[PDB]
Amino acid sequence: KVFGRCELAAAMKRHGLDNYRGYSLGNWVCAAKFESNFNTQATNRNTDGSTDYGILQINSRWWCNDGRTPGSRNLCNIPCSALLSSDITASVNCAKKIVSDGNGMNAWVAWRNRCKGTDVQAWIRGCRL
Amino acid sequence: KVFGRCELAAAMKRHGLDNYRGYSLGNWVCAAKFESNFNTQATNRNTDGSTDYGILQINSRWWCNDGRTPGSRNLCNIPCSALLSSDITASVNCAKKIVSDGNGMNAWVAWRNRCKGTDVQAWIRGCRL
Ligand SMILES: [Cl-]
Ligand SMILES: [Cl-]
Ligand code: NA
Ligand code: NA
Numbered sequence: 001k002v003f004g005r006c007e008l009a010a011a012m013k014r015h016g017l018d019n020y021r022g023y024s025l026g027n028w029v030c031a032a033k034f035e036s037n038f039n040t041q042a043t044n045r046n047t048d049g050s051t052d053y054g055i056l057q058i059n060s061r062w063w064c065n066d067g068r069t070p071g072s073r074n075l076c077n078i079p080c081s082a083l084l085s086s087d088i089t090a091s092v093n094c095a096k097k098i099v100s101d102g103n104g105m106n107a108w109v110a111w112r113n114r115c116k117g118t119d120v121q122a123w124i125r126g127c128r129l
Numbered sequence: 130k131v132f133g134r135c136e137l138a139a140a141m142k143r144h145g146l147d148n149y150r151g152y153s154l155g156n157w158v159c160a161a162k163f164e165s166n167f168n169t170q171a172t173n174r175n176t177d178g179s180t181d182y183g184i185l186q187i188n189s190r191w192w193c194n195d196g197r198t199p200g201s202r203n204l205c206n207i208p209c210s211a212l213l214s215s216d217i218t219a220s221v222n223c224a225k226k227i228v229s230d231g232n233g234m235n236a237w238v239a240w241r242n243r244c245k246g247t248d249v250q251a252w253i254r255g256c257r258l
Binding site for chain 1: 139145258
């Protein structure tokens, strides 16, 4: 599924990402935009052989099982294929674990490089939630 | 689809029923409960030959076209079958027209008899939206 901007913001709020660990909603919308372009079916292969999956491009090295990432962990206890669903629930719940890892939203490179320090409220401006 | 209580409240809010024409969210959840028991696929045949459809039991006499209600109107410009969808959008938008008809939520008998004058906030108590 390709989400519209305001539709994604609404769903993220529903699932409790609004101010989760102090990260305002616009931070999450901004991340998704630059990671996946709002596409739940995005995948990107990493040089190390790992794969990132879904709307927040969650990495198979640590977080999900794709059965083809030699010597990896499965810290969110899920198949990577669940993170490609139209339903963002599993992506969200895995994201909550990641952001609670100690490094916060710096675990998403695109968030660190393109969202951090900007005016993220612009990402939810003009949306009914 | 059979909705859970808190899930329905969230979706109604998303679609802008919260305080629509001054009707708080709990009023809408209460209505749906007693009309349909949270079931989008509910139908009930009226003595006059008309049929009520969906989560808010919207009547074919005035509001939708089912092709079998002799001499009826289609004021929401929709097939009645659209009001049975898992997606509540069409029910909601037709509901907004009805409640703007002049009689408010008195157009739902079960709302008038079971919700009106009660403490409707109890219907959304314990829900994250
Ligand atoms: Cl942090
Ligand atoms: Cl009124
Ligand atoms: Na893995
Ligand atoms: Na009709």
